Amino acid sequence: SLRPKLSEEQQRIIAILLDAHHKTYDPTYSDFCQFRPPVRVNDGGGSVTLELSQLSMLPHLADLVSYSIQKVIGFAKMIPGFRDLTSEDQIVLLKSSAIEVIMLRSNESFTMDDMSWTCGNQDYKYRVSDVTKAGHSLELIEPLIKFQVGLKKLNLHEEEHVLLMAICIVSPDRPGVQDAALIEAIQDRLSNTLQTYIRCRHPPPGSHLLYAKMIQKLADLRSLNEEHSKQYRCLSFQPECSMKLTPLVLEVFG
Numbered sequence: 001s002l003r004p005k006l007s008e009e010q011q012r013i014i015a016i017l018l019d020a021h022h023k024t025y026d027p028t029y030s031d032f033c034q035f036r037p038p039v040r041v042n043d044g045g046g047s048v049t050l051e052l053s054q055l056s057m058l059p060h061l062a063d064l065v066s067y068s069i070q071k072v073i074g075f076a077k078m079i080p081g082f083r084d085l086t087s088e089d090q091i092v093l094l095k096s097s098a099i100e101v102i103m104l105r106s107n108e109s110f111t112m113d114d115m116s117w118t119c120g121n122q123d124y125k126y127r128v129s130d131v132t133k134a135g136h137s138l139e140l141i142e143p144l145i146k147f148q149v150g151l152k153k154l155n156l157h158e159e160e161h162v163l164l165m166a167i168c169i170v171s172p173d174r175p176g177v178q179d180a181a182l183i184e185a186i187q188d189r190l191s192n193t194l195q196t197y198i199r200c201r202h203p204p205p206g207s208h209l210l211y212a213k214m215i216q217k218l219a220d221l222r223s224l225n226e227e228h229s230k231q232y233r234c235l236s237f238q239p240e241c242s243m244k245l246t247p248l249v250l251e252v253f254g
């Protein structure tokens, strides 16, 4: 069972992606106070009527997601080969993967300590009850939490985490892509980097079938993407919803 060494080029790709992530993911969440403030209405009963009437957490979470899409755009532009694509394909890939990369990158704030995304003091701790206060339902939130825990338990090296985000973005099978072959060539270069990295740098037993497990998470993300889109559609029917979102969020999901 051969373990070819990482090529000079593969090493450079990993370094570039690590740098890209460090430049676009602030692990202190220090910008979050700039978003519209979180508001948490009394909703212990999980009332859909109340949740939709108030959408109390939506301005804050929409601002968080919008900010994150901006960061993902920056990250993607640094992926080796991404700028070789036409502008049209770049935008198709970004719009189709945005929610999935947000879900992946959020794993860094997610904690199994209490099953929350913890981004600072209580104000910026986001729980399932906060997501329902933004107008989403359990059919999305429950599998989202299951996804976060499963990803956590893979114990990815940062190298593997950034590669997975890059592979997710540069996917040839997104609707509307023009040069699928070029996209696939870029993705293959990243996939080969990841497979090679796992085999020579990830110790047992966590390395066992790890690449397959990571590829399965990409399939899981497609499912969550579809469910999020259905739910966003419903949310959009609420009068005055657009003011609680952002122009970027409206474009990506509308």
Ligand SMILES: C=C1/C(=C\C=C2/CCC[C@]3(C)[C@@H]([C@H](C)c4ccc(C(C)(C)O)o4)CC[C@@H]23)C[C@@H](O)C[C@@H]1O
Binding pocket: 061, 062, 064, 065, 068, 102, 103, 105, 106, 107, 108, 109, 110, 117, 119, 126, 131, 134, 136, 140, 232, 249
């Ligand atoms: C973003 C990041 C973070 C959390 C992501 C969350 C927590 C709150 C609920 C969110 C935002 C989920 C929620 C279902 C969601 C995603 C998009 C939307 C809207 C409200 C736009 O429909 O709601 C998806 C990702 C979840 C914090 C930090 O890790 C940065 C990361 O980019």
